[PDB]
Amino acid sequence: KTFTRCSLAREMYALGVPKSELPQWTCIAEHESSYRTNVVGPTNSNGSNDYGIFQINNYYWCQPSNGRFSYNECHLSCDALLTDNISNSVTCARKIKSQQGWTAWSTWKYCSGSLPSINDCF
């Protein structure tokens, strides 16, 4: 359904995301999806749609079920990114960050500075 900052931070930590990244990840989730896992974004200017808690793009990262071309760099259906279990979204998001950096997210501009410590989540 909907995470909170700390529930998301805890789960992402459990899935191997370092704490030193969590404020950024949760800030991004908050902006992208308001921590909702099942959201498909409004269609973008290029006709693409973004999926899930991190609003991961269906032209680059996941394969639309409709078979429309995607680079599918995360190697999963976009529907895999809408599941209650965030593991797929996390693994994909980490890949996106590895390859493209935080600036892959348009909302990074809001999350690139001072952020609250995540320690209160732990």
CSV table of N, CA, C and O in Angstrom, one decimal:
chain,number,residue,atom,x,y,z
A,1,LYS,N,0.9,-1.2,0.0
A,1,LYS,CA,0.0,0.0,0.0
A,1,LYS,C,0.9,1.3,0.0
A,1,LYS,O,1.4,1.6,-1.0
A,2,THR,N,1.0,1.9,1.2
A,2,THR,CA,1.7,3.1,1.3
A,2,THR,C,2.7,2.9,2.5
A,2,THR,O,2.4,2.5,3.6
A,3,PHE,N,4.0,3.3,2.2
A,3,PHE,CA,5.0,3.2,3.2
A,3,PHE,C,5.0,4.5,3.9
A,3,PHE,O,4.3,5.5,3.5
A,4,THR,N,5.7,4.6,5.0
A,4,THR,CA,6.1,5.8,5.6
A,4,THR,C,7.6,5.9,5.4
A,4,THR,O,8.3,5.0,5.0
A,5,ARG,N,8.1,7.1,5.8
A,5,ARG,CA,9.6,7.3,5.7
A,5,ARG,C,10.3,6.2,6.4
A,5,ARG,O,11.2,5.6,5.8
A,6,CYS,N,9.9,5.9,7.6
A,6,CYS,CA,10.7,4.9,8.4
A,6,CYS,C,10.5,3.5,8.0
A,6,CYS,O,11.4,2.7,8.1
A,7,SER,N,9.2,3.2,7.6
A,7,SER,CA,9.0,1.8,7.2
A,7,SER,C,9.7,1.5,5.8
A,7,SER,O,10.3,0.4,5.7
A,8,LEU,N,9.8,2.5,4.9
A,8,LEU,CA,10.5,2.4,3.7
A,8,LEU,C,12.0,2.3,4.1
A,8,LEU,O,12.7,1.4,3.5
A,9,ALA,N,12.5,3.1,4.9
A,9,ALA,CA,13.9,3.1,5.3
A,9,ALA,C,14.3,1.8,5.8
A,9,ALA,O,15.3,1.2,5.5
A,10,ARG,N,13.5,1.3,6.8
A,10,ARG,CA,13.7,0.0,7.4
A,10,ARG,C,13.8,-1.2,6.4
A,10,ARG,O,14.7,-2.0,6.4
A,11,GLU,N,12.8,-1.2,5.5
A,11,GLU,CA,12.7,-2.3,4.5
A,11,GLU,C,13.9,-2.1,3.6
A,11,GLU,O,14.5,-3.2,3.2
A,12,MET,N,14.2,-0.9,3.1
A,12,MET,CA,15.3,-0.8,2.2
A,12,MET,C,16.6,-1.2,2.8
A,12,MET,O,17.5,-1.9,2.2
A,13,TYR,N,16.8,-0.8,4.1
A,13,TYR,CA,17.9,-1.3,4.8
A,13,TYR,C,18.0,-2.8,4.9
A,13,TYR,O,19.1,-3.4,4.8
A,14,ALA,N,16.8,-3.4,5.2
A,14,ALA,CA,16.8,-4.9,5.3
A,14,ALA,C,17.2,-5.5,4.0
A,14,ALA,O,17.8,-6.6,4.0
A,15,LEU,N,16.9,-4.8,2.9
A,15,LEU,CA,17.2,-5.4,1.5
A,15,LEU,C,18.6,-5.0,1.1
A,15,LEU,O,19.0,-5.3,-0.1
A,16,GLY,N,19.4,-4.3,1.9
A,16,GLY,CA,20.8,-4.1,1.7
A,16,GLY,C,21.2,-2.7,1.4
A,16,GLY,O,22.4,-2.5,1.1
A,17,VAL,N,20.3,-1.8,1.4
A,17,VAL,CA,20.6,-0.4,1.0
A,17,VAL,C,21.3,0.2,2.2
A,17,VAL,O,20.9,0.1,3.3
A,18,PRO,N,22.5,0.8,2.0
A,18,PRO,CA,23.2,1.4,3.2
A,18,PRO,C,22.3,2.6,3.8
A,18,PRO,O,21.7,3.3,3.1
A,19,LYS,N,22.4,2.7,5.1
A,19,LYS,CA,21.8,3.8,5.8
A,19,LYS,C,22.2,5.2,5.3
A,19,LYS,O,21.4,6.1,5.2
A,20,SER,N,23.5,5.3,4.8
A,20,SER,CA,24.0,6.6,4.3
A,20,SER,C,23.2,7.0,3.1
A,20,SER,O,23.4,8.2,2.7
A,21,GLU,N,22.5,6.2,2.5
A,21,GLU,CA,21.7,6.5,1.3
A,21,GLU,C,20.2,6.7,1.6
A,21,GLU,O,19.5,7.3,0.8
A,22,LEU,N,19.8,6.3,2.8
A,22,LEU,CA,18.3,6.2,3.0
A,22,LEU,C,17.6,7.5,3.0
A,22,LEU,O,16.5,7.6,2.4
A,23,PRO,N,18.1,8.6,3.6
A,23,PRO,CA,17.4,9.9,3.5
A,23,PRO,C,17.1,10.2,2.1
A,23,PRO,O,16.0,10.7,1.7
A,24,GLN,N,18.1,10.0,1.2
A,24,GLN,CA,17.9,10.4,-0.2
A,24,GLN,C,16.8,9.5,-0.9
A,24,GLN,O,15.9,10.0,-1.5
A,25,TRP,N,16.9,8.2,-0.6
A,25,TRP,CA,15.9,7.3,-1.2
A,25,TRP,C,14.5,7.6,-0.7
A,25,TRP,O,13.5,7.6,-1.5
A,26,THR,N,14.3,7.9,0.6
A,26,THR,CA,13.0,8.2,1.1
A,26,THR,C,12.5,9.5,0.6
A,26,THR,O,11.3,9.7,0.3
A,27,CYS,N,13.4,10.5,0.5
A,27,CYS,CA,13.0,11.8,-0.1
A,27,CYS,C,12.5,11.6,-1.5
A,27,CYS,O,11.5,12.1,-1.9
A,28,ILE,N,13.3,10.8,-2.3
A,28,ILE,CA,12.9,10.5,-3.7
A,28,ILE,C,11.5,9.8,-3.7
A,28,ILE,O,10.7,10.2,-4.5
A,29,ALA,N,11.4,8.8,-2.9
A,29,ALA,CA,10.1,8.1,-2.9
A,29,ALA,C,9.0,9.0,-2.5
A,29,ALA,O,7.8,9.0,-3.1
A,30,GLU,N,9.2,9.9,-1.5
A,30,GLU,CA,8.2,10.8,-1.1
A,30,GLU,C,7.7,11.6,-2.2
A,30,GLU,O,6.5,11.8,-2.5
A,31,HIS,N,8.6,12.2,-3.0
A,31,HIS,CA,8.3,13.0,-4.1
A,31,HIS,C,7.7,12.2,-5.3
A,31,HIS,O,6.7,12.7,-5.9
A,32,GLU,N,8.3,11.1,-5.6
A,32,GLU,CA,7.8,10.4,-6.8
A,32,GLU,C,6.5,9.8,-6.6
A,32,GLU,O,5.6,9.8,-7.5
A,33,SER,N,6.2,9.1,-5.4
A,33,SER,CA,5.0,8.3,-5.3
A,33,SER,C,4.3,8.5,-4.0
A,33,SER,O,3.3,7.8,-3.8
A,34,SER,N,4.8,9.4,-3.2
A,34,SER,CA,4.3,9.6,-1.8
A,34,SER,C,4.3,8.2,-1.1
A,34,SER,O,3.4,7.9,-0.3
A,35,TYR,N,5.4,7.5,-1.4
A,35,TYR,CA,5.6,6.2,-0.8
A,35,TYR,C,4.6,5.1,-1.2
A,35,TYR,O,4.6,4.0,-0.6
A,36,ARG,N,3.8,5.3,-2.3
A,36,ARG,CA,2.9,4.3,-2.7
A,36,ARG,C,3.6,3.3,-3.6
A,36,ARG,O,4.3,3.7,-4.5
A,37,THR,N,3.3,2.0,-3.4
A,37,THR,CA,3.9,1.0,-4.3
A,37,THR,C,3.2,0.8,-5.6
A,37,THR,O,3.9,0.4,-6.6
A,38,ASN,N,1.9,0.9,-5.7
A,38,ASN,CA,1.1,0.5,-6.8
A,38,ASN,C,0.8,1.6,-7.9
A,38,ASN,O,0.0,1.4,-8.8
A,39,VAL,N,1.5,2.7,-7.8
A,39,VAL,CA,1.2,3.8,-8.7
A,39,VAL,C,1.9,3.8,-10.0
A,39,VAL,O,3.1,3.5,-10.2
A,40,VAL,N,1.1,4.0,-11.1
A,40,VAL,CA,1.7,4.3,-12.4
A,40,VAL,C,1.5,5.7,-12.6
A,40,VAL,O,0.4,6.2,-12.6
A,41,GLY,N,2.6,6.4,-13.0
A,41,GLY,CA,2.5,7.9,-13.1
A,41,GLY,C,1.7,8.3,-14.3
A,41,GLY,O,1.4,7.5,-15.2
A,42,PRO,N,1.3,9.6,-14.4
A,42,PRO,CA,0.7,10.2,-15.6
A,42,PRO,C,1.7,9.9,-16.8
A,42,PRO,O,2.9,9.9,-16.6
A,43,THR,N,1.1,9.8,-17.9
A,43,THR,CA,1.9,9.5,-19.1
A,43,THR,C,2.9,10.7,-19.3
A,43,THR,O,2.5,11.9,-19.2
A,44,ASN,N,4.2,10.4,-19.5
A,44,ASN,CA,5.1,11.5,-19.8
A,44,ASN,C,5.0,12.1,-21.2
A,44,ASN,O,4.3,11.6,-22.0
A,45,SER,N,5.8,13.2,-21.4
A,45,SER,CA,5.8,13.9,-22.7
A,45,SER,C,6.2,12.9,-23.8
A,45,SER,O,5.7,13.1,-24.9
A,46,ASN,N,7.1,12.0,-23.5
A,46,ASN,CA,7.5,11.0,-24.5
A,46,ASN,C,6.6,9.7,-24.6
A,46,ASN,O,7.0,8.8,-25.3
A,47,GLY,N,5.4,9.8,-23.9
A,47,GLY,CA,4.5,8.6,-24.0
A,47,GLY,C,4.8,7.5,-23.1
A,47,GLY,O,4.1,6.5,-23.0
A,48,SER,N,5.9,7.7,-22.3
A,48,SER,CA,6.3,6.6,-21.4
A,48,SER,C,5.5,6.8,-20.1
A,48,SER,O,4.8,7.8,-19.8
A,49,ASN,N,5.6,5.8,-19.2
A,49,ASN,CA,5.0,5.9,-17.9
A,49,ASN,C,6.0,5.3,-16.9
A,49,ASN,O,6.9,4.5,-17.2
A,50,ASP,N,5.9,5.8,-15.7
A,50,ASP,CA,6.8,5.4,-14.6
A,50,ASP,C,6.0,4.6,-13.6
A,50,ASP,O,4.8,4.8,-13.4
A,51,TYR,N,6.7,3.6,-13.0
A,51,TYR,CA,6.0,2.6,-12.2
A,51,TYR,C,6.6,2.6,-10.8
A,51,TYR,O,7.8,2.5,-10.6
A,52,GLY,N,5.6,2.5,-9.9
A,52,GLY,CA,5.9,2.1,-8.5
A,52,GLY,C,6.5,3.2,-7.7
A,52,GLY,O,6.5,4.4,-8.0
A,53,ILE,N,7.0,2.8,-6.5
A,53,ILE,CA,7.4,3.7,-5.4
A,53,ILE,C,8.5,4.7,-5.8
A,53,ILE,O,8.5,5.8,-5.4
A,54,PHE,N,9.3,4.2,-6.8
A,54,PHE,CA,10.4,5.1,-7.3
A,54,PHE,C,10.1,5.6,-8.7
A,54,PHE,O,11.0,6.2,-9.3
A,55,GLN,N,8.9,5.3,-9.2
A,55,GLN,CA,8.5,5.9,-10.5
A,55,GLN,C,9.6,5.6,-11.6
A,55,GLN,O,10.2,6.5,-12.1
A,56,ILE,N,9.7,4.3,-11.8
A,56,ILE,CA,10.8,3.8,-12.7
A,56,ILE,C,10.2,3.7,-14.1
A,56,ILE,O,9.1,3.2,-14.4
A,57,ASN,N,11.0,4.3,-15.0
A,57,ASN,CA,10.5,4.5,-16.4
A,57,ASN,C,10.4,3.2,-17.3
A,57,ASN,O,11.3,2.4,-17.3
A,58,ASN,N,9.3,3.1,-18.0
A,58,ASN,CA,9.0,1.9,-18.8
A,58,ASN,C,9.6,2.0,-20.2
A,58,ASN,O,9.4,1.1,-21.0
A,59,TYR,N,10.4,3.0,-20.5
A,59,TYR,CA,11.2,3.0,-21.8
A,59,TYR,C,12.6,2.5,-21.6
A,59,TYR,O,13.2,1.9,-22.4
A,60,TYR,N,13.1,2.7,-20.4
A,60,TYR,CA,14.5,2.4,-20.1
A,60,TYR,C,14.7,1.2,-19.2
A,60,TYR,O,15.6,0.4,-19.3
A,61,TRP,N,13.8,1.0,-18.2
A,61,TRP,CA,14.1,0.2,-17.0
A,61,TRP,C,13.3,-1.1,-16.9
A,61,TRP,O,13.8,-2.1,-16.4
A,62,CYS,N,12.0,-1.0,-17.3
A,62,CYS,CA,11.2,-2.2,-17.2
A,62,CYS,C,10.4,-2.4,-18.5
A,62,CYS,O,10.2,-1.5,-19.3
A,63,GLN,N,10.0,-3.7,-18.8
A,63,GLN,CA,9.4,-4.0,-20.0
A,63,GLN,C,7.9,-3.9,-19.8
A,63,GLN,O,7.2,-4.6,-19.0
A,64,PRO,N,7.2,-3.0,-20.6
A,64,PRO,CA,5.8,-2.9,-20.7
A,64,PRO,C,5.2,-4.3,-21.1
A,64,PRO,O,5.8,-4.9,-22.0
A,65,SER,N,4.2,-4.7,-20.5
A,65,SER,CA,3.5,-5.9,-20.7
A,65,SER,C,2.9,-5.9,-22.1
A,65,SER,O,2.7,-7.0,-22.8
A,66,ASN,N,2.6,-4.7,-22.6
A,66,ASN,CA,2.1,-4.5,-24.0
A,66,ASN,C,3.1,-4.8,-25.1
A,66,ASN,O,2.8,-4.7,-26.2
A,67,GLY,N,4.3,-5.1,-24.7
A,67,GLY,CA,5.4,-5.5,-25.6
A,67,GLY,C,6.0,-4.3,-26.3
A,67,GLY,O,7.0,-4.5,-27.1
A,68,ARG,N,5.6,-3.1,-26.1
A,68,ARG,CA,6.2,-1.9,-26.6
A,68,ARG,C,7.7,-2.0,-26.3
A,68,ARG,O,8.1,-2.4,-25.2
A,69,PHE,N,8.6,-1.5,-27.2
A,69,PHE,CA,10.0,-1.5,-26.9
A,69,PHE,C,10.3,-0.8,-25.6
A,69,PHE,O,9.8,0.3,-25.4
A,70,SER,N,11.2,-1.4,-24.9
A,70,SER,CA,11.9,-0.8,-23.8
A,70,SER,C,13.3,-1.4,-23.7
A,70,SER,O,13.5,-2.6,-24.1
A,71,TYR,N,14.2,-0.6,-23.2
A,71,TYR,CA,15.6,-1.2,-22.9
A,71,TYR,C,15.5,-2.2,-21.8
A,71,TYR,O,16.4,-3.0,-21.7
A,72,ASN,N,14.4,-2.1,-21.0
A,72,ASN,CA,14.2,-3.1,-19.9
A,72,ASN,C,15.5,-3.4,-19.2
A,72,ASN,O,15.9,-4.5,-19.0
A,73,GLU,N,16.2,-2.3,-18.8
A,73,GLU,CA,17.6,-2.5,-18.2
A,73,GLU,C,17.5,-3.2,-16.8
A,73,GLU,O,18.5,-3.8,-16.4
A,74,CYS,N,16.4,-3.1,-16.1
A,74,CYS,CA,16.2,-3.8,-14.9
A,74,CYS,C,15.8,-5.3,-15.1
A,74,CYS,O,15.7,-6.0,-14.1
A,75,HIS,N,15.5,-5.6,-16.3
A,75,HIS,CA,15.1,-7.0,-16.7
A,75,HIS,C,13.8,-7.5,-15.9
A,75,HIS,O,13.9,-8.6,-15.3
A,76,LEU,N,12.8,-6.7,-16.0
A,76,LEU,CA,11.5,-7.2,-15.4
A,76,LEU,C,10.3,-6.5,-16.0
A,76,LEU,O,10.5,-5.5,-16.7
A,77,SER,N,9.1,-7.1,-15.8
A,77,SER,CA,8.0,-6.4,-16.3
A,77,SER,C,7.8,-5.2,-15.5
A,77,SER,O,8.1,-5.2,-14.3
A,78,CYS,N,7.2,-4.1,-16.0
A,78,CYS,CA,6.9,-3.0,-15.2
A,78,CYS,C,5.9,-3.3,-14.1
A,78,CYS,O,6.0,-2.7,-13.1
A,79,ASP,N,5.0,-4.3,-14.4
A,79,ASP,CA,4.1,-4.7,-13.3
A,79,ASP,C,4.9,-5.3,-12.1
A,79,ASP,O,4.4,-5.1,-10.9
A,80,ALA,N,6.1,-5.8,-12.3
A,80,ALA,CA,6.9,-6.3,-11.1
A,80,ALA,C,7.2,-5.1,-10.2
A,80,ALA,O,7.6,-5.3,-9.1
A,81,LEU,N,7.1,-3.9,-10.8
A,81,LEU,CA,7.5,-2.7,-10.0
A,81,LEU,C,6.3,-2.1,-9.2
A,81,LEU,O,6.5,-1.1,-8.6
A,82,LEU,N,5.2,-2.8,-9.2
A,82,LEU,CA,4.0,-2.3,-8.6
A,82,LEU,C,3.6,-3.1,-7.4
A,82,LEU,O,2.5,-2.9,-6.9
A,83,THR,N,4.4,-4.1,-7.1
A,83,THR,CA,4.0,-5.1,-6.1
A,83,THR,C,4.1,-4.6,-4.7
A,83,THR,O,4.9,-3.6,-4.5
A,84,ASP,N,3.4,-5.1,-3.7
A,84,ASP,CA,3.5,-4.7,-2.3
A,84,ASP,C,4.9,-4.9,-1.8
A,84,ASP,O,5.4,-4.1,-1.0
A,85,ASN,N,5.6,-5.9,-2.3
A,85,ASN,CA,7.0,-6.2,-1.9
A,85,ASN,C,7.8,-5.3,-2.7
A,85,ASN,O,7.8,-5.3,-4.0
A,86,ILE,N,8.6,-4.4,-2.1
A,86,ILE,CA,9.4,-3.4,-2.8
A,86,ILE,C,10.7,-4.0,-3.4
A,86,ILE,O,11.4,-3.2,-4.1
A,87,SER,N,11.1,-5.2,-3.1
A,87,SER,CA,12.4,-5.7,-3.4
A,87,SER,C,12.8,-5.5,-4.9
A,87,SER,O,13.9,-4.9,-5.1
A,88,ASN,N,11.9,-5.8,-5.9
A,88,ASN,CA,12.1,-5.5,-7.3
A,88,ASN,C,12.4,-4.0,-7.6
A,88,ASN,O,13.3,-3.7,-8.3
A,89,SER,N,11.6,-3.2,-7.0
A,89,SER,CA,11.7,-1.7,-7.1
A,89,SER,C,13.1,-1.2,-6.6
A,89,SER,O,13.7,-0.4,-7.1
A,90,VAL,N,13.5,-1.8,-5.4
A,90,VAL,CA,14.7,-1.4,-4.8
A,90,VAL,C,15.9,-1.9,-5.6
A,90,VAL,O,16.8,-1.1,-5.9
A,91,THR,N,15.9,-3.1,-6.0
A,91,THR,CA,16.9,-3.6,-6.8
A,91,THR,C,17.1,-2.8,-8.1
A,91,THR,O,18.1,-2.4,-8.5
A,92,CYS,N,15.9,-2.6,-8.8
A,92,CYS,CA,16.0,-1.7,-9.9
A,92,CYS,C,16.4,-0.3,-9.7
A,92,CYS,O,17.3,0.2,-10.4
A,93,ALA,N,15.9,0.3,-8.6
A,93,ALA,CA,16.3,1.7,-8.3
A,93,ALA,C,17.8,1.8,-8.0
A,93,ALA,O,18.5,2.8,-8.4
A,94,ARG,N,18.4,0.8,-7.3
A,94,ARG,CA,19.8,0.8,-7.0
A,94,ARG,C,20.6,0.7,-8.4
A,94,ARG,O,21.7,1.3,-8.5
A,95,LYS,N,20.2,-0.2,-9.3
A,95,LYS,CA,20.7,-0.3,-10.6
A,95,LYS,C,20.7,1.1,-11.3
A,95,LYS,O,21.7,1.5,-11.9
A,96,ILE,N,19.6,1.8,-11.3
A,96,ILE,CA,19.4,3.1,-11.9
A,96,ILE,C,20.4,4.0,-11.3
A,96,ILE,O,21.2,4.7,-12.0
A,97,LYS,N,20.5,4.1,-10.0
A,97,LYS,CA,21.5,4.9,-9.3
A,97,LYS,C,22.9,4.5,-9.7
A,97,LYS,O,23.7,5.4,-10.0
A,98,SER,N,23.2,3.2,-9.7
A,98,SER,CA,24.6,2.8,-10.1
A,98,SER,C,24.9,3.3,-11.5
A,98,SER,O,26.1,3.8,-11.7
A,99,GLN,N,24.0,3.2,-12.4
A,99,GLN,CA,24.3,3.5,-13.8
A,99,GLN,C,24.2,5.0,-14.2
A,99,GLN,O,24.9,5.5,-15.0
A,100,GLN,N,23.2,5.7,-13.5
A,100,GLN,CA,22.8,7.0,-14.0
A,100,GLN,C,23.0,8.0,-12.9
A,100,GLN,O,23.0,9.3,-13.1
A,101,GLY,N,23.1,7.5,-11.6
A,101,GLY,CA,23.3,8.4,-10.5
A,101,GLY,C,21.9,8.9,-10.0
A,101,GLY,O,20.9,8.6,-10.6
A,102,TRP,N,21.9,9.6,-8.8
A,102,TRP,CA,20.7,10.1,-8.3
A,102,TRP,C,20.0,11.0,-9.3
A,102,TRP,O,18.8,11.1,-9.2
A,103,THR,N,20.7,11.7,-10.1
A,103,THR,CA,20.1,12.6,-11.1
A,103,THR,C,19.2,11.9,-12.1
A,103,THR,O,18.5,12.6,-12.9
A,104,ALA,N,19.2,10.6,-12.1
A,104,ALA,CA,18.2,9.9,-12.9
A,104,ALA,C,16.8,10.3,-12.5
A,104,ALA,O,15.9,10.3,-13.3
A,105,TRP,N,16.6,10.6,-11.2
A,105,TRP,CA,15.3,11.1,-10.8
A,105,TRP,C,15.1,12.6,-10.9
A,105,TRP,O,16.0,13.3,-10.4
A,106,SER,N,14.1,13.0,-11.5
A,106,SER,CA,13.8,14.5,-11.6
A,106,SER,C,13.6,15.1,-10.2
A,106,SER,O,13.9,16.2,-10.0
A,107,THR,N,13.2,14.3,-9.3
A,107,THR,CA,12.9,14.8,-7.9
A,107,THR,C,14.2,14.9,-7.1
A,107,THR,O,14.2,15.5,-6.0
A,108,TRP,N,15.3,14.4,-7.6
A,108,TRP,CA,16.6,14.5,-6.9
A,108,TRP,C,16.9,15.9,-6.6
A,108,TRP,O,17.5,16.2,-5.5
A,109,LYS,N,16.5,16.9,-7.4
A,109,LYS,CA,16.7,18.3,-7.2
A,109,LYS,C,16.2,18.8,-5.8
A,109,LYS,O,16.7,19.8,-5.3
A,110,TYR,N,15.3,18.0,-5.3
A,110,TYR,CA,14.7,18.4,-4.0
A,110,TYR,C,15.4,17.7,-2.8
A,110,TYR,O,15.2,18.0,-1.7
A,111,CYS,N,16.1,16.6,-3.2
A,111,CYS,CA,16.7,15.7,-2.2
A,111,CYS,C,18.2,15.7,-2.1
A,111,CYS,O,18.8,14.9,-1.5
A,112,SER,N,18.8,16.7,-2.7
A,112,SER,CA,20.3,16.7,-3.0
A,112,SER,C,21.1,17.4,-1.9
A,112,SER,O,22.3,17.5,-2.0
A,113,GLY,N,20.4,17.9,-0.9
A,113,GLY,CA,21.0,18.8,0.1
A,113,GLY,C,20.8,18.2,1.5
A,113,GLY,O,20.8,17.0,1.6
A,114,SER,N,20.7,19.1,2.4
A,114,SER,CA,20.4,18.7,3.8
A,114,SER,C,19.1,17.9,3.8
A,114,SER,O,18.2,18.2,3.0
A,115,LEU,N,19.1,16.8,4.6
A,115,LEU,CA,18.0,15.9,4.7
A,115,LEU,C,18.1,15.5,6.2
A,115,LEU,O,19.2,15.5,6.8
A,116,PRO,N,16.9,15.2,6.8
A,116,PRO,CA,16.9,14.7,8.2
A,116,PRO,C,17.7,13.4,8.3
A,116,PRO,O,17.7,12.6,7.3
A,117,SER,N,18.3,13.1,9.4
A,117,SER,CA,19.0,11.8,9.7
A,117,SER,C,17.9,10.7,9.7
A,117,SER,O,16.8,10.9,10.0
A,118,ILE,N,18.3,9.5,9.2
A,118,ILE,CA,17.4,8.4,9.2
A,118,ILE,C,17.4,7.6,10.5
A,118,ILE,O,16.7,6.7,10.7
A,119,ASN,N,18.3,8.1,11.4
A,119,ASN,CA,18.5,7.3,12.6
A,119,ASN,C,17.3,7.0,13.5
A,119,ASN,O,17.2,6.0,14.1
A,120,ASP,N,16.4,8.0,13.5
A,120,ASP,CA,15.1,7.8,14.2
A,120,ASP,C,14.3,6.7,13.6
A,120,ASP,O,13.3,6.3,14.3
A,121,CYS,N,14.6,6.2,12.4
A,121,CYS,CA,13.9,5.1,11.9
A,121,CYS,C,14.4,3.7,12.4
A,121,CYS,O,13.8,2.7,12.1
A,122,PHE,N,15.5,3.8,13.1
A,122,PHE,CA,16.2,2.5,13.5
A,122,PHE,C,16.3,2.3,14.9
A,122,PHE,O,17.0,1.4,15.4
